[PDB]
Amino acid sequence: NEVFLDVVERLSVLIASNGSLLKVDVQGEIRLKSFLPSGSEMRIGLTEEFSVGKSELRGYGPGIRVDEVSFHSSVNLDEFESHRILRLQPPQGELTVMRYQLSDDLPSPLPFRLFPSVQWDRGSGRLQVYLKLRCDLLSKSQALNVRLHLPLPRGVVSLSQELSSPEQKAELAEGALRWDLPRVQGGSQLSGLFQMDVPGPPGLGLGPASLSFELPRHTCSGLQVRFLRLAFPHKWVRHLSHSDAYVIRI
């Protein structure tokens, strides 16, 4: 039978207008789906490295770590301290095996950096917004369904846009720019120039930008499942990060 094990991490970030990281949050889970014969016992091995918490004695350094961890009540932790192995007899269907959280710097660079340039004629109503997005993932790695949402001043309309590659889409809707970038890889640099008209009052507020995306074959924390072993079967072990709150001030 089939067994699915997914490490899934929700990333939230707040980045300042100068590019400084103000806040980073990772909420992670390890989710299982399986329908194994009676008797079955499963062992999951995680990154052998990894530390948990902020030890007052040892401190915390570079390396793979989470700030806190919690486990399903059915999980046996006899081999967790020595070997980072979890043991359980799963139910039929879905189970969340482990949850964890991280609020410190990530072990790799943040996946996206934005370089906005805004010129505002107070004036003639002319607003020019140039956005450059750089993907800082490894060059082999992909970001899927990337969308940038940018709230705009009340009553703004679009005069023109120039997008840096033809697969990109952008429109204004509900008072915000929505810019979709379906092709994004580590090292990509994608840009859009938007000419808008801002009406005078009857009769800012630009930003912040919020990115949403999925990062297949990736964890923000660096945590990984090393093995999945069954004792009595096709296995899928997947690692994914995603955000709907990757916020960047303009």
């Binding site: 806190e68 961890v69 919690s70 486990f71 399903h72 009540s73 932790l77 967790f80 949850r99």
Partner: peptide
Amino acid sequence: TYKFFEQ
């Protein structure tokens, strides 16, 4: 030592 949840 460890925190557990039921769901």
